[PDB]
Design a protein around this ligand. Structure first.
Ligand SMILES: N#CC[C@@H]([C@H]1CCN(c2cccc(Cl)c2C#N)C1)n1cc(-c2ncnc3[nH]ccc23)cn1
Length: 297
């Protein structure tokens, strides 16, 4: 008789599924390590009225498994100071991470441009927000490993969010740290001594990175006062492959980044507590939250 076909089952729409054909590239936003982030418009109506989104894709060069792990981490993080997961675009092994777009960008471009409207009180409120997002990440047993002002996005003049989780790793249950094997592109000037010499990553190692991020915040991310520029002035700049060993020696000696210009000593002492040589001796994120809240009174 008649040709047999398939009964069409009801097709429910997934709001976290972004079709490639409607995901239109506007410009590059940033990049890091094996990935890149682009501003796109998701435009199913094809009239330029669609929502603007930030799209993470792998740089052509392996790392598919890392991007998929990052998607699964971000998809399950829900915090006011953590960039919002929106969905995915699937290829086919390929995948793209869809996040909310924050037009003000990172603190690295925002602070040098908005010094006049961002006073100490606002800088301390951003510090609290970063600590709150980080404490939430730590409570879910994750280490960020790339905490720097460059990875902090501006939602508005009054709110910041951790904007990238490209290097985020889980800590094991009944364990205290993550062991790194791939360290070639490490942001060494933001790293705790245990990360540089023993390749161990603790929640206390993220507290060290926060201390350096706080210093950047207080210097309005000025390029000439950057953690890299300051440490290279301290140890020497032209040392090539000997730079990390010279940095470790400097930290063992008790030397640290100086107090930023116009930064009060009470704020500098909270920053120094992030830089205790032993991780067990360092301040916690909750203690930092209470320290800043006390200065905001
Ligand atoms: N945060 C941040 C800084 C960079 C990203 C860019 C990639 N990057 C990485 C870093 C390390 C490892 C890896 Cl694997 C990567 C990768 N990939 C950092 N950035 C994001 C925006 C941005 N701007 C507006 N809205 C946004 N919504 C989400 C993000 C976003 C602008 N610059």
């Amino acid at each position: 008789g008649d040709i047999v076909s398939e009964k069409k089952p009801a097709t429910e729409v997934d709001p976290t599924h972004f079709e490639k054909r409607f995901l239109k590239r506007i410009r590059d936003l940033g990049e890091g390590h094996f990935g890149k982030v682009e501003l796109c418009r998701y435009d199913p109506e094809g009239d330029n009225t669609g929502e603007q989104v930030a799209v993470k894709s792998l740089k052509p060069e392996n790392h598919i498994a890392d991007l998929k792990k990052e998607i699964e981490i971000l998809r399950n993080l829900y915090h006011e100071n953590i960039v919002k997961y929106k969905g995915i675009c699937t290829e086919g092994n390929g995948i793209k991470l869809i996040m909310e777009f924050l037009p003000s960008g990172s603190l690295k471009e925002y602070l040098p441009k908005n010094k006049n409207k961002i006073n100490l009180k606002q800088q301390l409120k951003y510090a609290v927000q970063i600590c709150k997002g980080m404490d939430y990440l730590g409570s879910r047993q994750y280490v960020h490993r790339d905490l720097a002002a460059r990875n902090v996005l501006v939602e508005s003049e009054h709110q910041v969010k951790i904007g990238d989780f490209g290097l985020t790793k889980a800590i094991e249950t009944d364990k205290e740290y993550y062991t790194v094997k791939d360290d070639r592109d490490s942001p060494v000037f933001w790293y705790a001594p245990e990360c540089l010499m023993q390749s161990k990553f603790y929640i206390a190692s993220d507290v060290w990175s926060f201390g350096v991020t706080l210093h950047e915040l207080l210097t309005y991310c000025d390029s000439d006062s950057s953690p890299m520029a300051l440490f290279l002035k301290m140890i020497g700049p032209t040392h090539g492959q000997m730079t990390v060993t010279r940095l470790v020696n400097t930290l063992k000696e008790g030397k640290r980044l100086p107090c930023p210009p116009n930064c009060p000593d009470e704020v500098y002492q909270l920053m120094r507590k992030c830089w205790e040589f032993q991780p067990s001796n360092r301040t916690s994120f909750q203690n930092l939250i209470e320290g800043f809240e006390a200065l905001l009174k």
